[PDB]
Amino acid sequence: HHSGLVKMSHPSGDVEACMVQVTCGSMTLNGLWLDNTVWCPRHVMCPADQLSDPNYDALLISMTNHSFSVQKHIGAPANLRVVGHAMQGTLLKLTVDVANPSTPAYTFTTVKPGAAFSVLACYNGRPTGTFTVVMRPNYTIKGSFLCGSCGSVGYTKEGSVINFCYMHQMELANGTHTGSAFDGTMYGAFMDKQVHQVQLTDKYCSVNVVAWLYAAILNGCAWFVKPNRTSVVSFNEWALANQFTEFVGTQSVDMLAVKTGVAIEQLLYAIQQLYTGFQGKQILGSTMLEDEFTPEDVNMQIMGVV
Amino acid sequence: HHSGLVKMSHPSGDVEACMVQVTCGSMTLNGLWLDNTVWCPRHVMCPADQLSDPNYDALLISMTNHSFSVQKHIGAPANLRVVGHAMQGTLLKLTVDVANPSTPAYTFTTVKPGAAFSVLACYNGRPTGTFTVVMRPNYTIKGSFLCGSCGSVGYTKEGSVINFCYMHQMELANGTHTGSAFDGTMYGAFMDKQVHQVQLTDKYCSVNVVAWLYAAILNGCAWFVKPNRTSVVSFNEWALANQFTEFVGTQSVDMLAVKTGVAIEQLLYAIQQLYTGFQGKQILGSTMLEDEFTPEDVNMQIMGVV
Ligand SMILES: *[C@H](O)[C@H](C[C@@H]1CCNC1=O)NC(=O)[C@H](CC(C)C)NC(=O)OC[C@@H]1CCC(=O)N1CCc1ccccc1
């Protein structure tokens, strides 16, 4: 029996119309053109043989408006004249003389651990694929990014409003990925320098494991549900010692509890038991806990509720 | 011997000139006036009788520009006419007919656990005090806020640029505080609703304990330094077992290591030993580890390095 869950991304057309190529010096990558602004990673300014220890303040000083070449290849091609340049954290903010006529309604937001967002993977200003990821508790994502992908963007959507939350910057030693928010901060404690960096431990996202167990119940799979319960406070004490995030309930989780008649505290108890082993059984085709589906994913994909 | 460390805030004058009072119906709090925008917490729209589960989308639709009353009290008083209103996350963005003539150079940024920022505490649009806090690992601050303080702002400063990072929203059960970033997200998993919320465990901020031990050494207090070392990898495994954040070194910590001649790993070992007990001894007047001073504080206040 199939769960009815897939890795679901937003439709990407609105964001496709905002992608451009940015070239500076010897480097090229992707940028995001919104209104009269093009956003891109600041390491486009770095000579390839200095990415280990750049002085970004000095690099920026050394640039003029004409140092940046901005090209839209998709749809109606365009070359955008840069009339101002600025740095915000790890991003460049290039002002251009033409407002993107396809700018969608949008905001900038930061994504939190356990939350899902959609990525539009781009190369040379050309979108090539889309996928969805969950921000991990150690502020990496398990993405799929190759050389030239920097400046690819991640986003959520509320109604018709695109909430941009991620701009790709780098790949870590363990194959995971991280990037910037559009306030210019890197996620987590990472820095946009080409050096090996301390990686924090990952954890299971407890809220998402609960959502997945609710998805199992919604599919008729509930052998792991017992009358036994673990309080949220007791679970969160246990989580600290056992590689789980602390559980914080939400209206989305509550909706799943009401629809199934299974209390959150029953599933917190179940998680504690399942973490010691599934004992030969499967849940939705898995023998390990799944934390890559959110409560919102389960509500939307199984119940049609947004 | 006094360490030379105090809790140091930025001079507040530039931010004082941006504070206003925002009133909606019978609710009032503070806002931040930059250019033609006033930022404030969206719960100013909520009747005191409905704060437990507000329908903020419906509340926003019910408002008109005339629903909001904005006054500047400090300096040259002004009554500011609202000409547009919108909501971003947990903040309102009110457009006013006058641009703040004292708008400083500014950006919006998010602050990370362990980082310090300055707070300007305001009541009824009038600044009353300033203090500094570190963002705790559980995304609370140990502040000093009473009824009417919402909309008080926190910020850092780089050169002449004010980086706004915090707008005050709420007090938690244990007396700590939290708020929003100016992308409208609440810090942590918190929600701007008047209901009990799960409080995540706090942790010691390792990078700041290291800074404080370097401050001790700079002041001639180094009895806890041994040849013994703990690697960053080993310490971080220990940290997860002992309620400490994982350590991620920075250029600022590195400068302290060079100035004192003591390696980070020697202090990581010392922390492990001191956490089991100071053995009746004191460090900079303390019998417990201190994590409220950053590496930058130590560099700036003791060595004069910004
Ligand atoms: C805004 O000025 C004000 C600032 C508060 C007031 C006291 N000190 C502060 O820092 N903020 C609010 O009034 C909040 C409004 C929400 C965001 C809609 N509410 C708030 O801070 O409530 C605090 C109280 C006391 C401690 C606590 O837990 N709560 C929430 C309600 C509660 C739930 C369960 C158990 C006990 C209390």
Side-chain angles (χ1 to χ4, degrees), chain A residues 1-48 51-52 54-92 94-157 159-192 194-195 197-202 204-225 227-242 244-250 252-258 260-280 282-305, chain B residues 1-48 51-52 54-73 75-92 94-125 127-157 159-192 194-195 197-202 204-225 227-236 238-242 244-250 252-258 260-278 280 282-305:
Chain A
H1 197 300
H2 169 56
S3 66
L5 293 173
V6 302
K7 297 304 191 71
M8 183 87 72
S9 289
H10 293 288
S12 62
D14 282 358
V15 177
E16 289 170 53
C18 299
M19 301 305 304
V20 297
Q21 177 170 24
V22 180
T23 307
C24 181
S26 55
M27 305 267 287
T28 192
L29 40 58
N30 310 281
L32 182 73
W33 180 25
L34 305 166
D35 299 326
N36 289 85
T37 303
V38 174
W39 301 85
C40 69
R42 66 177 175 174
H43 69 263
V44 75
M45 300 189 293
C46 201
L51 292 170
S52 290
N55 187 309
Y56 285 113
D57 287 349
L59 288 168
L60 184 73
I61 285 154
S62 79
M63 294 312 159
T64 82
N65 286 329
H66 325 279
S67 302
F68 301 94
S69 173
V70 178
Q71 310 170 258
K72 176 183 167 78
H73 305 300
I74 293 316
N79 184 287
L80 304 185
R81 194 170 67 122
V82 178
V83 296
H85 61 280
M87 187 160 66
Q88 178 148 352
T90 60
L91 300 182
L92 293 182
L94 308 178
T95 307
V96 292
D97 57 3
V98 176
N100 183 349
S102 295
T103 302
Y106 76 94
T107 75
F108 296 139
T109 191
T110 48
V111 70
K112 288 164 186 311
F117 59 100
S118 290
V119 175
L120 183 62
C122 301
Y123 297 85
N124 300 313
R126 304 179 162 76
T128 56
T130 193
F131 58 91
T132 178
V133 291
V134 156
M135 180 60 72
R136 300 304 307 169
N138 65 1
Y139 291 104
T140 68
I141 59 171
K142 295 177 190 189
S144 180
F145 297 104
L146 298 173
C147 285
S149 56
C150 286
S152 296
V153 296
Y155 57 98
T156 64
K157 208 188 222 157
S160 64
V161 180
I162 297 164
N163 316 308
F164 294 104
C165 61
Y166 180 89
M167 181 161 271
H168 186 55
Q169 296 264 14
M170 65 196 243
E171 186 169 309
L172 299 318
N174 73 344
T176 64
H177 301 102
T178 195
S180 311
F182 283 83
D183 65 3
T185 65
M186 296 289 309
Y187 278 97
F190 296 104
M191 293 189 305
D192 64 333
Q194 192 158 296
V195 302
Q197 290 181 46
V198 180
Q199 222 180 134
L200 280 58
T201 194
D202 204 350
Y204 289 102
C205 300
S206 62
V207 174
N208 288 355
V209 180
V210 165
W212 175 72
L213 290 180
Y214 277 123
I217 295 160
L218 291 165
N219 276 277
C221 177
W223 58 266
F224 51 83
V225 182
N228 304 69
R229 300 184 170 218
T230 296
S231 69
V232 170
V233 165
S234 177
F235 179 86
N236 286 348
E237 298 175 354
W238 175 90
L240 299 179
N242 290 279
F244 282 75
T245 61
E246 294 175 276
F247 178 87
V248 178
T250 68
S252 188
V253 183
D254 291 340
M255 288 190 281
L256 299 172
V258 168
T260 65
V262 179
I264 289 169
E265 289 85 358
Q266 292 174 264
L267 295 186
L268 298 185
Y269 182 87
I271 287 171
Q272 294 177 316
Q273 316 310 116
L274 292 166
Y275 180 74
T276 75
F278 283 42
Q279 273 184 65
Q282 283 181 140
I283 301 176
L284 296 180
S286 184
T287 59
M288 56 191 67
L289 299 168
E290 170 68 85
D291 72 350
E292 294 192 331
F293 294 105
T294 67
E296 291 85 4
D297 284 319
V298 175
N299 275 288
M300 289 192 293
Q301 288 191 45
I302 295 171
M303 287 153 52
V305 191
Chain B
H1 193 279
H2 167 55
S3 70
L5 292 178
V6 303
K7 293 300 182 60
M8 185 86 73
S9 292
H10 293 298
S12 60
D14 289 358
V15 178
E16 292 171 50
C18 301
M19 303 303 308
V20 294
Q21 180 173 22
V22 180
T23 304
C24 186
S26 64
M27 299 268 285
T28 189
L29 38 62
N30 310 281
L32 184 71
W33 180 27
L34 304 170
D35 306 315
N36 288 266
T37 302
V38 173
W39 302 86
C40 69
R42 64 174 174 174
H43 71 259
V44 75
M45 294 185 298
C46 197
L51 287 172
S52 64
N55 191 331
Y56 285 114
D57 291 327
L59 286 167
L60 185 69
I61 282 150
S62 85
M63 292 308 146
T64 75
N65 293 333
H66 304 295
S67 302
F68 301 98
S69 173
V70 184
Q71 285 90 58
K72 178 193 171 60
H73 299 298
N79 182 32
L80 302 179
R81 202 168 76 81
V82 175
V83 300
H85 57 282
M87 180 167 64
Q88 183 157 346
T90 62
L91 301 179
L92 291 173
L94 304 179
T95 305
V96 290
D97 58 350
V98 177
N100 185 352
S102 300
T103 301
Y106 75 94
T107 73
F108 296 145
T109 190
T110 46
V111 66
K112 293 170 183 298
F117 61 99
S118 293
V119 175
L120 184 64
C122 303
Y123 296 84
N124 306 303
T128 60
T130 197
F131 60 94
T132 177
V133 290
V134 285
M135 179 61 70
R136 303 300 310 168
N138 64 359
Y139 291 102
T140 69
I141 56 172
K142 301 185 181 164
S144 178
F145 293 107
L146 303 174
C147 279
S149 62
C150 284
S152 295
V153 297
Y155 61 96
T156 66
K157 199 182 287 209
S160 57
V161 181
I162 298 173
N163 309 314
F164 289 107
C165 60
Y166 178 91
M167 180 161 269
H168 186 53
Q169 296 259 14
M170 71 192 310
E171 186 168 301
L172 295 320
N174 72 343
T176 66
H177 301 101
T178 197
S180 308
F182 283 84
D183 66 4
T185 64
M186 302 280 298
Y187 280 98
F190 293 109
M191 289 173 283
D192 63 331
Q194 191 95 35
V195 60
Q197 309 195 25
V198 185
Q199 216 180 137
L200 272 59
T201 193
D202 201 2
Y204 284 108
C205 178
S206 302
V207 169
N208 293 352
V209 178
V210 168
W212 176 74
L213 292 177
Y214 277 125
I217 295 156
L218 291 166
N219 274 279
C221 182
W223 62 266
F224 51 86
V225 177
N228 307 63
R229 293 181 177 217
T230 300
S231 68
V232 173
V233 164
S234 297
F235 179 82
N236 285 348
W238 175 94
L240 300 174
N242 285 273
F244 280 73
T245 61
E246 289 179 279
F247 176 91
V248 183
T250 65
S252 186
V253 179
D254 291 340
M255 298 171 60
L256 298 174
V258 162
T260 63
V262 173
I264 289 166
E265 290 79 5
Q266 286 173 275
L267 295 189
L268 297 183
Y269 178 89
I271 287 174
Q272 299 178 306
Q273 311 320 308
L274 292 165
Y275 181 71
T276 71
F278 284 34
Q282 297 191 357
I283 300 178
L284 295 179
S286 178
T287 51
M288 50 192 73
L289 298 169
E290 168 72 84
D291 74 351
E292 294 186 348
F293 295 103
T294 65
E296 290 86 356
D297 287 322
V298 175
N299 277 116
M300 277 188 298
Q301 293 195 40
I302 293 173
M303 290 153 52
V305 172

PDB file of all heavy atoms in Angstrom, chain A residues 86-112, unseen atoms left out:
ATOM      1  N   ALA A  86      25.988  46.798  -4.134  1.00  0.00           N
ATOM      2  CA  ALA A  86      26.078  46.818  -2.691  1.00  0.00           C
ATOM      3  C   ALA A  86      26.206  45.387  -2.197  1.00  0.00           C
ATOM      4  O   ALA A  86      25.879  44.423  -2.903  1.00  0.00           O
ATOM      5  CB  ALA A  86      24.849  47.493  -2.072  1.00  0.00           C
ATOM      6  N   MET A  87      26.696  45.252  -0.976  1.00  0.00           N
ATOM      7  CA  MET A  87      26.853  43.952  -0.341  1.00  0.00           C
ATOM      8  C   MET A  87      25.945  43.898   0.872  1.00  0.00           C
ATOM      9  O   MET A  87      25.855  44.869   1.624  1.00  0.00           O
ATOM     10  CB  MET A  87      28.313  43.736   0.054  1.00  0.00           C
ATOM     11  CG  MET A  87      28.622  42.371   0.572  1.00  0.00           C
ATOM     12  SD  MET A  87      30.395  42.005   0.468  1.00  0.00           S
ATOM     13  CE  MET A  87      31.072  43.179   1.628  1.00  0.00           C
ATOM     14  N   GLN A  88      25.247  42.786   1.044  1.00  0.00           N
ATOM     15  CA  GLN A  88      24.503  42.547   2.271  1.00  0.00           C
ATOM     16  C   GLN A  88      24.882  41.163   2.753  1.00  0.00           C
ATOM     17  O   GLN A  88      24.406  40.166   2.200  1.00  0.00           O
ATOM     18  CB  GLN A  88      23.002  42.640   2.096  1.00  0.00           C
ATOM     19  CG  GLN A  88      22.375  42.331   3.426  1.00  0.00           C
ATOM     20  CD  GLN A  88      21.107  43.052   3.671  1.00  0.00           C
ATOM     21  OE1 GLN A  88      20.708  43.931   2.904  1.00  0.00           O
ATOM     22  NE2 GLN A  88      20.450  42.692   4.757  1.00  0.00           N
ATOM     23  N   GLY A  89      25.686  41.112   3.796  1.00  0.00           N
ATOM     24  CA  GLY A  89      26.167  39.834   4.283  1.00  0.00           C
ATOM     25  C   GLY A  89      26.911  39.145   3.173  1.00  0.00           C
ATOM     26  O   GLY A  89      27.832  39.711   2.575  1.00  0.00           O
ATOM     27  N   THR A  90      26.469  37.930   2.872  1.00  0.00           N
ATOM     28  CA  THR A  90      27.079  37.041   1.896  1.00  0.00           C
ATOM     29  C   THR A  90      26.474  37.193   0.513  1.00  0.00           C
ATOM     30  O   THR A  90      26.793  36.388  -0.369  1.00  0.00           O
ATOM     31  CB  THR A  90      26.967  35.595   2.363  1.00  0.00           C
ATOM     32  OG1 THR A  90      25.591  35.215   2.538  1.00  0.00           O
ATOM     33  CG2 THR A  90      27.731  35.380   3.690  1.00  0.00           C
ATOM     34  N   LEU A  91      25.579  38.165   0.314  1.00  0.00           N
ATOM     35  CA  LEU A  91      24.973  38.397  -0.995  1.00  0.00           C
ATOM     36  C   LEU A  91      25.377  39.753  -1.546  1.00  0.00           C
ATOM     37  O   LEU A  91      25.656  40.692  -0.799  1.00  0.00           O
ATOM     38  CB  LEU A  91      23.444  38.352  -0.929  1.00  0.00           C
ATOM     39  CG  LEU A  91      22.863  37.051  -0.440  1.00  0.00           C
ATOM     40  CD1 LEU A  91      21.320  37.060  -0.439  1.00  0.00           C
ATOM     41  CD2 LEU A  91      23.353  35.844  -1.256  1.00  0.00           C
ATOM     42  N   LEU A  92      25.368  39.848  -2.870  1.00  0.00           N
ATOM     43  CA  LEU A  92      25.431  41.122  -3.547  1.00  0.00           C
ATOM     44  C   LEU A  92      24.026  41.528  -3.925  1.00  0.00           C
ATOM     45  O   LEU A  92      23.198  40.688  -4.280  1.00  0.00           O
ATOM     46  CB  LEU A  92      26.273  41.056  -4.814  1.00  0.00           C
ATOM     47  CG  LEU A  92      27.743  40.810  -4.715  1.00  0.00           C
ATOM     48  CD1 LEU A  92      28.300  40.840  -6.134  1.00  0.00           C
ATOM     49  CD2 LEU A  92      28.417  41.852  -3.813  1.00  0.00           C
ATOM     50  N   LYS A  93      23.781  42.815  -3.859  1.00  0.00           N
ATOM     51  CA  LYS A  93      22.539  43.428  -4.288  1.00  0.00           C
ATOM     52  C   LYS A  93      22.940  44.374  -5.409  1.00  0.00           C
ATOM     53  O   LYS A  93      23.603  45.387  -5.152  1.00  0.00           O
ATOM     54  CB  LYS A  93      21.894  44.111  -3.083  1.00  0.00           C
ATOM     55  CG  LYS A  93      20.491  44.605  -3.204  1.00  0.00           C
ATOM     56  CD  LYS A  93      19.957  44.972  -1.806  1.00  0.00           C
ATOM     57  N   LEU A  94      22.624  43.991  -6.651  1.00  0.00           N
ATOM     58  CA  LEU A  94      22.941  44.773  -7.840  1.00  0.00           C
ATOM     59  C   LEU A  94      21.669  45.491  -8.259  1.00  0.00           C
ATOM     60  O   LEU A  94      20.638  44.856  -8.480  1.00  0.00           O
ATOM     61  CB  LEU A  94      23.446  43.901  -8.985  1.00  0.00           C
ATOM     62  CG  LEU A  94      24.597  42.963  -8.658  1.00  0.00           C
ATOM     63  CD1 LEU A  94      24.962  42.126  -9.869  1.00  0.00           C
ATOM     64  CD2 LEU A  94      25.779  43.792  -8.187  1.00  0.00           C
ATOM     65  N   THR A  95      21.731  46.800  -8.349  1.00  0.00           N
ATOM     66  CA  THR A  95      20.599  47.550  -8.846  1.00  0.00           C
ATOM     67  C   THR A  95      20.713  47.653 -10.362  1.00  0.00           C
ATOM     68  O   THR A  95      21.791  47.947 -10.891  1.00  0.00           O
ATOM     69  CB  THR A  95      20.544  48.937  -8.211  1.00  0.00           C
ATOM     70  OG1 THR A  95      20.592  48.810  -6.783  1.00  0.00           O
ATOM     71  CG2 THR A  95      19.260  49.636  -8.615  1.00  0.00           C
ATOM     72  N   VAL A  96      19.604  47.406 -11.053  1.00  0.00           N
ATOM     73  CA  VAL A  96      19.574  47.458 -12.509  1.00  0.00           C
ATOM     74  C   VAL A  96      18.552  48.499 -12.954  1.00  0.00           C
ATOM     75  O   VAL A  96      17.680  48.921 -12.193  1.00  0.00           O
ATOM     76  CB  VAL A  96      19.282  46.078 -13.119  1.00  0.00           C
ATOM     77  CG1 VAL A  96      20.462  45.125 -12.885  1.00  0.00           C
ATOM     78  CG2 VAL A  96      18.024  45.483 -12.516  1.00  0.00           C
ATOM     79  N   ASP A  97      18.694  48.949 -14.205  1.00  0.00           N
ATOM     80  CA  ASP A  97      17.896  50.072 -14.678  1.00  0.00           C
ATOM     81  C   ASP A  97      16.489  49.691 -15.118  1.00  0.00           C
ATOM     82  O   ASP A  97      15.692  50.590 -15.421  1.00  0.00           O
ATOM     83  CB  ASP A  97      18.602  50.753 -15.847  1.00  0.00           C
ATOM     84  CG  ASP A  97      18.888  49.800 -16.999  1.00  0.00           C
ATOM     85  OD1 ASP A  97      18.490  48.614 -16.928  1.00  0.00           O
ATOM     86  OD2 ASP A  97      19.520  50.248 -17.980  1.00  0.00           O
ATOM     87  N   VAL A  98      16.177  48.407 -15.195  1.00  0.00           N
ATOM     88  CA  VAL A  98      14.872  47.923 -15.630  1.00  0.00           C
ATOM     89  C   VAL A  98      14.295  47.033 -14.540  1.00  0.00           C
ATOM     90  O   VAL A  98      14.986  46.149 -14.021  1.00  0.00           O
ATOM     91  CB  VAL A  98      14.979  47.158 -16.959  1.00  0.00           C
ATOM     92  CG1 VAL A  98      13.638  46.581 -17.325  1.00  0.00           C
ATOM     93  CG2 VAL A  98      15.463  48.104 -18.056  1.00  0.00           C
ATOM     94  N   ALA A  99      13.025  47.246 -14.214  1.00  0.00           N
ATOM     95  CA  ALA A  99      12.343  46.368 -13.273  1.00  0.00           C
ATOM     96  C   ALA A  99      11.914  45.097 -13.992  1.00  0.00           C
ATOM     97  O   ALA A  99      11.397  45.150 -15.118  1.00  0.00           O
ATOM     98  CB  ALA A  99      11.124  47.053 -12.666  1.00  0.00           C
ATOM     99  N   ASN A 100      12.166  43.960 -13.362  1.00  0.00           N
ATOM    100  CA  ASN A 100      11.754  42.690 -13.949  1.00  0.00           C
ATOM    101  C   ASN A 100      10.252  42.751 -14.209  1.00  0.00           C
ATOM    102  O   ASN A 100       9.460  42.829 -13.259  1.00  0.00           O
ATOM    103  CB  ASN A 100      12.093  41.526 -13.029  1.00  0.00           C
ATOM    104  CG  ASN A 100      11.746  40.209 -13.653  1.00  0.00           C
ATOM    105  OD1 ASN A 100      11.072  40.167 -14.698  1.00  0.00           O
ATOM    106  ND2 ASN A 100      12.168  39.138 -13.025  1.00  0.00           N
ATOM    107  N   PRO A 101       9.811  42.737 -15.469  1.00  0.00           N
ATOM    108  CA  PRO A 101       8.366  42.823 -15.724  1.00  0.00           C
ATOM    109  C   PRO A 101       7.589  41.618 -15.237  1.00  0.00           C
ATOM    110  O   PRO A 101       6.357  41.698 -15.147  1.00  0.00           O
ATOM    111  CB  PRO A 101       8.274  42.963 -17.250  1.00  0.00           C
ATOM    112  CG  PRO A 101       9.561  42.488 -17.785  1.00  0.00           C
ATOM    113  CD  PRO A 101      10.600  42.624 -16.709  1.00  0.00           C
ATOM    114  N   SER A 102       8.261  40.503 -14.947  1.00  0.00           N
ATOM    115  CA  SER A 102       7.617  39.309 -14.414  1.00  0.00           C
ATOM    116  C   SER A 102       7.815  39.144 -12.920  1.00  0.00           C
ATOM    117  O   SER A 102       7.667  38.034 -12.402  1.00  0.00           O
ATOM    118  CB  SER A 102       8.120  38.074 -15.160  1.00  0.00           C
ATOM    119  OG  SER A 102       7.713  38.142 -16.504  1.00  0.00           O
ATOM    120  N   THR A 103       8.142  40.208 -12.194  1.00  0.00           N
ATOM    121  CA  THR A 103       8.321  40.051 -10.766  1.00  0.00           C
ATOM    122  C   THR A 103       7.026  39.531 -10.151  1.00  0.00           C
ATOM    123  O   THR A 103       5.986  40.173 -10.301  1.00  0.00           O
ATOM    124  CB  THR A 103       8.692  41.358 -10.073  1.00  0.00           C
ATOM    125  OG1 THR A 103       9.885  41.892 -10.644  1.00  0.00           O
ATOM    126  CG2 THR A 103       8.929  41.098  -8.588  1.00  0.00           C
ATOM    127  N   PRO A 104       7.060  38.431  -9.409  1.00  0.00           N
ATOM    128  CA  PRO A 104       5.858  37.957  -8.714  1.00  0.00           C
ATOM    129  C   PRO A 104       5.658  38.709  -7.409  1.00  0.00           C
ATOM    130  O   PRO A 104       6.546  39.399  -6.924  1.00  0.00           O
ATOM    131  CB  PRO A 104       6.164  36.483  -8.456  1.00  0.00           C
ATOM    132  CG  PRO A 104       7.655  36.466  -8.242  1.00  0.00           C
ATOM    133  CD  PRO A 104       8.222  37.569  -9.137  1.00  0.00           C
ATOM    134  N   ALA A 105       4.482  38.538  -6.816  1.00  0.00           N
ATOM    135  CA  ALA A 105       4.325  38.995  -5.444  1.00  0.00           C
ATOM    136  C   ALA A 105       5.263  38.173  -4.571  1.00  0.00           C
ATOM    137  O   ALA A 105       5.310  36.949  -4.695  1.00  0.00           O
ATOM    138  CB  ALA A 105       2.890  38.835  -4.970  1.00  0.00           C
ATOM    139  N   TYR A 106       6.043  38.832  -3.719  1.00  0.00           N
ATOM    140  CA  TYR A 106       7.049  38.077  -2.989  1.00  0.00           C
ATOM    141  C   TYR A 106       7.403  38.746  -1.675  1.00  0.00           C
ATOM    142  O   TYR A 106       7.193  39.945  -1.474  1.00  0.00           O
ATOM    143  CB  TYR A 106       8.342  37.902  -3.793  1.00  0.00           C
ATOM    144  CG  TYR A 106       9.201  39.152  -3.840  1.00  0.00           C
ATOM    145  CD1 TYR A 106      10.243  39.358  -2.926  1.00  0.00           C
ATOM    146  CD2 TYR A 106       8.977  40.116  -4.802  1.00  0.00           C
ATOM    147  CE1 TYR A 106      11.014  40.509  -2.975  1.00  0.00           C
ATOM    148  CE2 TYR A 106       9.728  41.263  -4.861  1.00  0.00           C
ATOM    149  CZ  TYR A 106      10.749  41.459  -3.950  1.00  0.00           C
ATOM    150  OH  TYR A 106      11.498  42.609  -4.029  1.00  0.00           O
ATOM    151  N   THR A 107       7.970  37.942  -0.793  1.00  0.00           N
ATOM    152  CA  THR A 107       8.614  38.419   0.419  1.00  0.00           C
ATOM    153  C   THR A 107       9.899  37.621   0.615  1.00  0.00           C
ATOM    154  O   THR A 107      10.167  36.636  -0.084  1.00  0.00           O
ATOM    155  CB  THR A 107       7.738  38.248   1.670  1.00  0.00           C
ATOM    156  OG1 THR A 107       7.733  36.864   2.035  1.00  0.00           O
ATOM    157  CG2 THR A 107       6.317  38.689   1.435  1.00  0.00           C
ATOM    158  N   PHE A 108      10.700  38.057   1.589  1.00  0.00           N
ATOM    159  CA  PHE A 108      11.885  37.326   2.013  1.00  0.00           C
ATOM    160  C   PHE A 108      11.602  36.810   3.409  1.00  0.00           C
ATOM    161  O   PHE A 108      11.090  37.558   4.243  1.00  0.00           O
ATOM    162  CB  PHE A 108      13.132  38.199   2.038  1.00  0.00           C
ATOM    163  CG  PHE A 108      13.552  38.736   0.698  1.00  0.00           C
ATOM    164  CD1 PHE A 108      13.993  40.041   0.587  1.00  0.00           C
ATOM    165  CD2 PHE A 108      13.588  37.944  -0.415  1.00  0.00           C
ATOM    166  CE1 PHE A 108      14.409  40.545  -0.618  1.00  0.00           C
ATOM    167  CE2 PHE A 108      14.017  38.469  -1.628  1.00  0.00           C
ATOM    168  CZ  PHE A 108      14.422  39.744  -1.719  1.00  0.00           C
ATOM    169  N   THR A 109      11.918  35.541   3.660  1.00  0.00           N
ATOM    170  CA  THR A 109      11.699  34.932   4.966  1.00  0.00           C
ATOM    171  C   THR A 109      12.822  33.938   5.229  1.00  0.00           C
ATOM    172  O   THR A 109      13.500  33.474   4.314  1.00  0.00           O
ATOM    173  CB  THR A 109      10.330  34.247   5.050  1.00  0.00           C
ATOM    174  OG1 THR A 109      10.050  33.902   6.409  1.00  0.00           O
ATOM    175  CG2 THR A 109      10.306  32.966   4.255  1.00  0.00           C
ATOM    176  N   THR A 110      13.060  33.638   6.488  1.00  0.00           N
ATOM    177  CA  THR A 110      14.030  32.608   6.823  1.00  0.00           C
ATOM    178  C   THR A 110      13.281  31.333   7.163  1.00  0.00           C
ATOM    179  O   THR A 110      12.246  31.374   7.832  1.00  0.00           O
ATOM    180  CB  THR A 110      14.884  33.010   8.023  1.00  0.00           C
ATOM    181  OG1 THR A 110      14.014  33.480   9.052  1.00  0.00           O
ATOM    182  CG2 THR A 110      15.889  34.088   7.646  1.00  0.00           C
ATOM    183  N   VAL A 111      13.798  30.207   6.711  1.00  0.00           N
ATOM    184  CA  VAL A 111      13.206  28.906   6.979  1.00  0.00           C
ATOM    185  C   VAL A 111      13.847  28.331   8.237  1.00  0.00           C
ATOM    186  O   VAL A 111      15.013  28.604   8.555  1.00  0.00           O
ATOM    187  CB  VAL A 111      13.364  27.982   5.745  1.00  0.00           C
ATOM    188  CG1 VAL A 111      14.802  27.567   5.526  1.00  0.00           C
ATOM    189  CG2 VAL A 111      12.481  26.763   5.871  1.00  0.00           C
ATOM    190  N   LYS A 112      13.087  27.554   8.970  1.00  0.00           N
ATOM    191  CA  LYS A 112      13.505  26.969  10.215  1.00  0.00           C
ATOM    192  C   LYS A 112      13.753  25.478  10.054  1.00  0.00           C
ATOM    193  O   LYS A 112      13.201  24.829   9.151  1.00  0.00           O
ATOM    194  CB  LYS A 112      12.444  27.184  11.284  1.00  0.00           C
ATOM    195  CG  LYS A 112      12.413  28.660  11.717  1.00  0.00           C
ATOM    196  CD  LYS A 112      11.185  29.015  12.459  1.00  0.00           C
ATOM    197  CE  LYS A 112      11.137  30.535  12.725  1.00  0.00           C
ATOM    198  NZ  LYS A 112      12.384  31.108  13.302  1.00  0.00           N
TER     199      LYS A 112
END
